[PDB]
Amino acid sequence: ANIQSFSFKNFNSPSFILQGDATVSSGKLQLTKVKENGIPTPSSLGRAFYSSPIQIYDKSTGAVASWATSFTVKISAPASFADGIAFALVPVGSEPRRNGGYLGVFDSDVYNNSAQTVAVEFDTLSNSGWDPSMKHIGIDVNSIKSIATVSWDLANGENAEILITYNAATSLLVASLVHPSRRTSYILSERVDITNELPEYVSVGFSATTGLSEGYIETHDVLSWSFASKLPDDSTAEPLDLASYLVRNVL
Amino acid sequence: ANIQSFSFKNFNSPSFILQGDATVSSGKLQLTKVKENGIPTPSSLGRAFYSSPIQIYDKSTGAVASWATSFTVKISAPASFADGIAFALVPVGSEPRRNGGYLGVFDSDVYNNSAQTVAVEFDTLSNSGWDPSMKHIGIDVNSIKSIATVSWDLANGENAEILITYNAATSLLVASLVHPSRRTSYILSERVDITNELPEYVSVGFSATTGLSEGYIETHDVLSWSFASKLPD
Amino acid sequence: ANIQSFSFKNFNSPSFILQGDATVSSGKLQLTKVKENGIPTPSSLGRAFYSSPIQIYDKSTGAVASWATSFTVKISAPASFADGIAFALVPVGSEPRRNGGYLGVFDSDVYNNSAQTVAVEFDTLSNSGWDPSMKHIGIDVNSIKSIATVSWDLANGENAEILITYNAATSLLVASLVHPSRRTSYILSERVDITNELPEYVSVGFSATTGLSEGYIETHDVLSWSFASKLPD
Amino acid sequence: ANIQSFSFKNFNSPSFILQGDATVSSGKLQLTKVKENGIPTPSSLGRAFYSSPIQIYDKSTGAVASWATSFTVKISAPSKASFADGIAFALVPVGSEPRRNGGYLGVFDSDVYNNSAQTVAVEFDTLSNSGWDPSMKHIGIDVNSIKSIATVSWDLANGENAEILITYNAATSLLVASLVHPSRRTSYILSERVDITNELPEYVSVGFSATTGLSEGYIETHDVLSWSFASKLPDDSTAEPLDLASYLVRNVL
Numbered sequence: 029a030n031i032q033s034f035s036f037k038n039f040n041s042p043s044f045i046l047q048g049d050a051t052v053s054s055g056k057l058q059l060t061k062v063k064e065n066g067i068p069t070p071s072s073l074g075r076a077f078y079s080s081p082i083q084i085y086d087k088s089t090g091a092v093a094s095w096a097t098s099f100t101v102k103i104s105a106p107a108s109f110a111d112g113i114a115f116a117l118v119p120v121g122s123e124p125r126r127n128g129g130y131l132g133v134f135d136s137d138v139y140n141n142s143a144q145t146v147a148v149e150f151d152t153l154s155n156s157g158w159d160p161s162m163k164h165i166g167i168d169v170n171s172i173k174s175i176a177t178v179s180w181d182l183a184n185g186e187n188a189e190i191l192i193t194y195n196a197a198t199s200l201l202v203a204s205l206v207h208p209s210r211r212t213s214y215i216l217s218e219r220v221d222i223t224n225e226l227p228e229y230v231s232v233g234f235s236a237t238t239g240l241s242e243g244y245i246e247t248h249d250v251l252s253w254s255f256a257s258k259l260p261d262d263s264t265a266e267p268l269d270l271a272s273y274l275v276r277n278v279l
Numbered sequence: 280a281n282i283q284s285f286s287f288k289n290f291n292s293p294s295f296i297l298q299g300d301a302t303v304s305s306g307k308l309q310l311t312k313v314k315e316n317g318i319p320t321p322s323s324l325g326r327a328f329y330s331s332p333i334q335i336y337d338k339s340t341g342a343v344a345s346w347a348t349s350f351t352v353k354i355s356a357p358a359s360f361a362d363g364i365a366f367a368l369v370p371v372g373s374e375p376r377r378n379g380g381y382l383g384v385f386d387s388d389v390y391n392n393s394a395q396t397v398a399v400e401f402d403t404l405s406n407s408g409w410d411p412s413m414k415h416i417g418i419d420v421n422s423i424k425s426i427a428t429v430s431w432d433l434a435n436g437e438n439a440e441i442l443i444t445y446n447a448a449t450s451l452l453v454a455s456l457v458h459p460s461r462r463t464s465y466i467l468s469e470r471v472d473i474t475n476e477l478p479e480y481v482s483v484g485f486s487a488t489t490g491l492s493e494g495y496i497e498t499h500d501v502l503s504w505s506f507a508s509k510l511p512d
Numbered sequence: 513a514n515i516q517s518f519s520f521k522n523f524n525s526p527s528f529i530l531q532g533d534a535t536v537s538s539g540k541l542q543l544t545k546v547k548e549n550g551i552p553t554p555s556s557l558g559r560a561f562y563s564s565p566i567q568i569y570d571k572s573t574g575a576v577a578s579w580a581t582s583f584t585v586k587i588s589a590p591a592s593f594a595d596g597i598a599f600a601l602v603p604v605g606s607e608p609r610r611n612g613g614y615l616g617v618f619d620s621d622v623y624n625n626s627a628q629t630v631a632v633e634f635d636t637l638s639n640s641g642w643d644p645s646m647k648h649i650g651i652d653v654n655s656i657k658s659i660a661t662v663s664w665d666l667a668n669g670e671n672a673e674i675l676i677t678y679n680a681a682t683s684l685l686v687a688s689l690v691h692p693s694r695r696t697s698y699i700l701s702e703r704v705d706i707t708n709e710l711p712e713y714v715s716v717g718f719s720a721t722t723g724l725s726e727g728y729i730e731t732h733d734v735l736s737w738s739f740a741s742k743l744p745d
Numbered sequence: 746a747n748i749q750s751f752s753f754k755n756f757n758s759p760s761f762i763l764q765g766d767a768t769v770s771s772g773k774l775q776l777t778k779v780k781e782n783g784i785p786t787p788s789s790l791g792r793a794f795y796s797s798p799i800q801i802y803d804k805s806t807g808a809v810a811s812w813a814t815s816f817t818v819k820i821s822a823p824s825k826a827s828f829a830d831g832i833a834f835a836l837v838p839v840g841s842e843p844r845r846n847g848g849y850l851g852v853f854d855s856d857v858y859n860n861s862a863q864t865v866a867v868e869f870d871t872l873s874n875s876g877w878d879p880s881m882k883h884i885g886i887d888v889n890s891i892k893s894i895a896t897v898s899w900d901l902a903n904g905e906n907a908e909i910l911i912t913y914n915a916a917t918s919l920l921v922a923s924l925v926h927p928s929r930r931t932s933y934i935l936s937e938r939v940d941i942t943n944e945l946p947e948y949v950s951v952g953f954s955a956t957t958g959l960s961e962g963y964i965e966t967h968d969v970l971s972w973s974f975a976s977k978l979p980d981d982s983t984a985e986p987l988d989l990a991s992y993l994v995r996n997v998l
């Protein structure tokens with residue numbers, strides 16, 4: 029089995045690939061532009077990935093990896109919320125895509141297998157063309173139109189503790205968010221045939237955009253991030269030990 | 280920091296403390312009685328804990344542990360569902376408590392700090408005296424009347440993958456359940472001041488009971504279990 | 513796969529099985545008796561094991577566990593060194609054995625499979641009947657006469673950081689010691705067919721004895737201990 | 746605390762930075778050139794590092810990382826030839842380009858201490874160079890010079906697996922290296938104090954470097970069959986060694 033994992037409580041540019049307005053300051057990862065006075069900027073786009081590629085599966089052996097990631101984000105608006113942040117698995121060379129409601133990871137709301145991108149979004153602005161009525165968490169598979177969503181009551185300026193996992197045995201992708209301050213929690217799950225939607229190797233990280241209008245803005249700060257992946261030697265899949273993963277990585 | 284952790288995909292009596300009708304068979308942990316033909320039995324009560332005590336906090340240093348546990352259960356009814364299964368943190372010497380709707384871990388629905396027990400229940404039968412309308416997941420703190428619950432649609436005979444965690448920094452206890460077969464998931468969270476509700480050392484494990492009537496029965500099988508704890512200095 | 517692991521930087525009696533003069537004080541594990549003034553005592557014997565049994569192998573599946581342990585000991589003599597400390601894998605019910613040069617884990621220097629005990633010793637006193645000329649580290653398999661040893665220059669009163677591992681793939685048991693203060697290190701390795709020398713379940717821990725004479729004494733303090741085991745399917 | 750770790754039982758180019766003749770084939774990492782017929786080549790040099798930099802310490806907080814690595818190598822020399830030159834596990838500056846070949850193992854330029862080299866390595870030297878080497882084949886700790894600050898004799902078992910384990914404990918500042926040839930049940934260990942914050946930069950790349958002899962008959966192969974690495978950087982000055990019991994079973998065993 030092959031394993032790769034990391035856990036950061038403090039950020040520094042060397043281990044990350046930064047794109048767009050993504051910057052590291054005061055130990056935290058700021059995905060979108062922010063004026064010196066502290067207020068967000070419109071039309072911003074930022075991405076950040078771990079500098080080492082992760083192998084999601086192996087065509088020759090037929091093995092599929094199980095993985096998990098957890099991070100803490102803080103979204104603040106002075107002003108209306110827009111556009112959101114996504115955790116994404118993109119092709120290794122990958123360059124940013126459309127901004128605004130496309131969150132920098134997609135080009136359209138029509139399924140396009142060739143986009144080879146899967147993401148879990150925390151959408152703060154409903155786009156009439158493809159979005160559910162309110163702020164939501166969604167699973168995007170090669171299109172900005174989530175294959176599943178759940179309502180989310182964003183607590184402005186308060187920490188959000190997210191946990192995403194993929195179990196190769198059940199092919200189930202599960203995402204959950206918790207706002208400790210309000211004792212509120214959300215969860216969502218859907219089956220995803222990963223070997224068909226992504227390449228063998230991918231970069232893992234975040235993508236975030238602000239609104240395209242003067243008053244549709246918010247900040248996207250990642251305060252901590254952990255990731256762990258396990259690729260077996262044969263077809264037989266083996267979920268990860270989360271009890272052990274969080275305490276040794278998150279708690 | 281002190282750490283203790285384990286992960287079982289196969290069960291064997293040696294590493295566990297079995298109470299009541301709790302038994303290990305064919306590699307799985309069966310908390311409640313089951314007739315040879317495979318059908319559950321009424322008035323059953325079973326408990327099982329890891330043989331090594333876990334230190335939840337330290338009075339002298341003021342440190343509080345963060346921990347997590349995950350397991351897979353399978354609940355089946357031929358009949359009506361009753362009574363449920365709970366993941367519990369009990370005092371080390373601890374003997375079973377009332378059966379039926381008390382799930383073997385409590386004696387009343389009135390808060391009693393001296394019970395020194397905290398549990399996360401998967402309640403399959405609504406007891407008029409203290410339960411919400413339907414089947415639910417709840418956090419119990421020294422009383423069978425959950426301080427918080429969430430509706431749960433139990434998928435009969437299908438695996439349930441549960442994950443419970445306690446974060447000492449936020450004092451937040453979070454429980455989640457997933458039925459992979461139906462792609463359904465539930466989550467619940469509530470702040471718990473653990474150092475006030477439990478002793479420094481506890482045993483961790485499960486407790487399960489069946490209904491007290493002829494037709495209120497179900498099975499409680501644990502197929503795998505992991506636990507991890509970290510106590511700072 | 514089944515996994516069990518723990519790591520202590522601070523000790524407390526609840527999670528351990530203490531035998532003989534083994535005691536926990538000021539957060540450390542003291543295996544042998546010590547007078548209030550701080551000086552060791554002769555004819556002492558102490559043992560301590562983790563309260564949860566560990567499965568070394570499985571007869572039905574034919575799987576053998578790989579494991580590792582690491583700890584820090586401090587041995588001090590006011591006086592001549594005796595008798596030593598051992599890391600041992602004993603049968604679960606196991607009661608102490610002969611003291612003195614037998615380190616509390618064996619009864620003779622003649623191989624006796626029925627002893628079902630394997631130990632890695634840090635022998636501070638050469639017993640003419642079975643010991644190499646000086647202080648040594650040795651691997652004992654069902655007898656106090658090590659099947660392999662290595663010379664060891666004990667640094668009185670200075671910490672010793674030990675690491676022992678068992679690789680089921682190669683059947684190799686490897687032990688190593690490091691005295692950071694003197695920048696000295698020792699290593700030893702030998703093949704051991706574990707499934708033949710021990711039972712499926714064992715208790716893991718330490719055993720230590722002092723000399724049987726008035727001036728053959730030393731202290732045996734364990735300052736930290738970690739253990740990890742993995743049993744495949 | 747910041748943590749980074751990985752463990753490979755099978756190799757693939759994407760996650761590694763390959764330099765020189767370093768190549769990945771049949772799942773293993775081949776550091777030095779090898780003719781199709783299987784025999785090694787002279788004057789070869791190969792290096793390979795994990796694609797993500799590792800932070801060894803932090804100047805602002807004064808924290809120093811504790812880390813460990815373990816790997817399995819197989820060194821082989823054809824009957825008619827002689828062993829040369831060796832393989833090293835190294836911690837080099839991030840941009841770092843290969844250095845002198847032959848007995849310099851691709852990581853150093855001289856046997857005179859040069860702090861500006863900012864490189865620390867643990868070598869498995871198969872050829873004694875009169876100018877700075879002990880009499881026989883050895884394991885040594887090199888700190889900014891090819892002349893080890895400490896060595897230990899090593900009886901290389903030709904063609905047999907070598908299981909190496911290297912660790913650095915920030916609390917004691919002790920670097921410890923060990924090798925085991927399971928086939929022969931032989932083992933070696935070496936240890937020495939190293940003030941890492943003074944010999945290396947805050948960020949480094951971790952990996953291997955290997956060279957073959959500069960003569961027609963001084964050649965050997967350098968194959969890495971598996972590799973694990975784990976690092977932990979605290980938030981303050983206070984150092985905390987790693988849990989090796991847990992590290993090997995979860996990574997090596």
Ligand SMILES: Nc1ncnc2[nH]cnc12
Nearest residue numbers: 191192193202204442455
């Ligand atoms: N990703 C996830 N988030 C929350 N609970 C889970 N249970 C299993 N996977 C989970």
Ligand SMILES: Nc1ncnc2[nH]cnc12
Nearest residue numbers: 191442443444453454455
């Ligand atoms: N116990 C838990 N279950 C699901 N998601 C979580 N996120 C944090 N703790 C969690």
Ligand SMILES: Nc1ncnc2[nH]cnc12
Nearest residue numbers: 675676677686687688923
């Ligand atoms: N037990 C052990 N001690 C020291 N080095 C080792 N390398 C492999 N096993 C070892």
Ligand SMILES: Nc1ncnc2[nH]cnc12
Nearest residue numbers: 688910911912921922923
């Ligand atoms: N690097 C190392 N190799 C072998 N034994 C060790 N004990 C502590 N560190 C070690």
Ligand SMILES: [Ca+2]
Nearest residue numbers: 129151153155
């Ligand atoms: Ca949107």
Ligand SMILES: [Ca+2]
Nearest residue numbers: 380402404406
């Ligand atoms: Ca009930």
Ligand SMILES: [Ca+2]
Nearest residue numbers: 613635637639
């Ligand atoms: Ca002796």
Ligand SMILES: [Ca+2]
Nearest residue numbers: 848870872874
């Ligand atoms: Ca040389």
Ligand SMILES: [Mn+2]
Nearest residue numbers: 151159166174
């Ligand atoms: Mn959306």
Ligand SMILES: [Mn+2]
Nearest residue numbers: 402410417425
């Ligand atoms: Mn209830």
Ligand SMILES: [Mn+2]
Nearest residue numbers: 635643650658
């Ligand atoms: Mn001896």
Ligand SMILES: [Mn+2]
Nearest residue numbers: 870878885893
């Ligand atoms: Mn040399």
